């Protein structure tokens, strides 16, 4: 069994994003935590990091997400970065993935 | 069982020329070294007829040395089916891979007078120690039976080492 709905859906949505040219607001979410990474392709380089497992916070992971959401803005917007795309990878734009995006407010956005 | 050759060294000189001068181009190689040489065609032929990638050639060669080499490929030009380049493989202390003749021994093998000898492979690929090198291999069983088959693990297999893949293959049958 080569490649999986996971790996597939992952490329599918992520490949489209990488065409538009913008900086990528990649979102990896785990069972316990949710992390966020602003990457620049063609330079193969990350610019602004913002995890929850790095901000040692907890209590309802939909609300944690938004926090690490707003956390990403602050750190980033202070580096000039304003406009970006927003990955979303394998995750449907919903719950804590949608939450973090809604948190990414106070920083460029359009999402 | 022991065959002497001779040899020389190559660097320049077009193989075309050597060829013209009765000499037969060729390379000498193994895990450690690789160098181009040339034998004498008239000489080499005499040896290889009997040698024949089955037995070991010692290869004299200035340098006074005497190198344990099997012949692992003979390129002969199709137009005259004569050889045009030999490449000699030199042995060291590490199990090699080779072809060993198959002394079809026994008899008409069961149901005698008669049956079918069914000759498949006058050789066989074996991973063996460069030290002990079987001159051939006894292939008897008894024999034998009618419509049977000596696979491969049924064969003698002297204290060389073992087979070379192909656990199950013809080698014997009567029909």
């Amino acid at each position: 069994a080569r490649l999986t709905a996971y790996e597939r859906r992952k490329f599918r949505v992520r490949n489209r994003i990488k065409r538009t040219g913008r900086l990528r607001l990649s979102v990896f979410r785990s069972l316990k935590h949710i992390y966020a990474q602003i990457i620049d392709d063609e330079k193969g380089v990350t610019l602004v990091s913002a995890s929850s497992l790095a901000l040692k916070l907890k209590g309802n992971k939909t609300e944690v997400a938004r926090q690490v959401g707003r956390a990403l803005a602050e750190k980033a917007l202070a580096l000039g970065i304003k406009q970006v795309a927003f990955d979303r990878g394998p995750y449907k734009y919903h719950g804590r993935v949608k939450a973090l995006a809604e948190g990414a407010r106070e920083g460029g956005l359009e999402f | 069982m022991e065959y002497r050759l001779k040899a020389y060294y190559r660097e320049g000189e077009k193989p075309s020329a050597l060829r013209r001068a009765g000499k037969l181009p060729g390379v000498m190689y193994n895990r450690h070294l690789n160098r181009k040489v040339y034998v004498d065609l008239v000489e080499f032929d005499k040896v290889f007829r009997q040698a024949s990638i089955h037995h070991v050639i010692v290869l004299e060669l200035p340098d006074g040395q005497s190198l344990p080499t099997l012949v692992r490929q003979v390129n002969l030009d199709k137009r005259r089916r004569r050889p045009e380049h030999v490449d000699f493989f030199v042995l060291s202390d590490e199990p090699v891979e080779m072809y060993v003749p198959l002394r079809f021994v026994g008899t008409p093998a069961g149901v005698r007078a008669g049956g079918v000898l069914q000759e498949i492979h006058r050789d066989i690929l074996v991973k063996v120690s460069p030290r002990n090198i079987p001159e051939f291999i006894e292939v008897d069983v008894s024999g034998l039976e009618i419509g049977d088959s000596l696979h491969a693990s049924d064969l003698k297999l002297p204290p060389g080492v073992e087979l070379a893949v192909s656990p199950e293959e013809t080698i014997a049958a009567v029909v």
């Binding site: - | 024949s52 003979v74 002969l76 137009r79 089916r81």
Partner: protein, 141 residues
């Protein structure tokens, strides 16, 4: 005589014969063989006449091999006609044979016998030939 059943395309160009025997080429089934010295198209009806000549001079045992096969469609107009309007028409099949190739090749017979058969068999061919035995060199595999 001897044609290849089911063909993707009937009627094929003709190409040249500058080759030198793709291979081949080194005997691989019998004790003796007939090798092609010249390039030619060998006709199924030429092969069948070479085969028979041997099985015949072998009492009936015997053990040919042939090794060449007529897969090339040979065409030819209906004569008494002029160029243009379709192509040949197919009147048989040939095997392409450049020098080096081993045709036929026999086994399970004496030498003064196999060699006499191969000679006969050779007279049925439009090219010059050569009889071989098979030594180490042949064991090219």
């Amino acid at each position: 005589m001897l044609m290849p059943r089911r063909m993707k395309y009937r009627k094929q160009q003709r190409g040249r014969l500058k080759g030198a025997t793709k291979g081949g080429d080194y005997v691989a089934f019998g004790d003796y063989g007939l090798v092609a010295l010249e390039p030619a198209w060998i006709t199924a009806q030429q092969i069948e006449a070479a085969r028979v000549a041997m099985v015949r001079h072998f009492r009936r045992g015997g053990k040919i091999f042939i090794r060449i096969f007529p897969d090339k469609p040979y065409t030819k107009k209906p004569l008494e006609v002029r160029m243009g309007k379709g192509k040949g028409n197919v009147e048989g099949y040939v095997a392409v044979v450049k020098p080096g190739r081993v045709m036929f090749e026999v086994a399970g017979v004496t030498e003064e016998q196999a060699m006499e058969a191969l000679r006969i068999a050779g007279h049925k061919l439009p090219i010059k030939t050569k009889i071989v035995r098979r030594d180490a060199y042949d064991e090219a595999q």
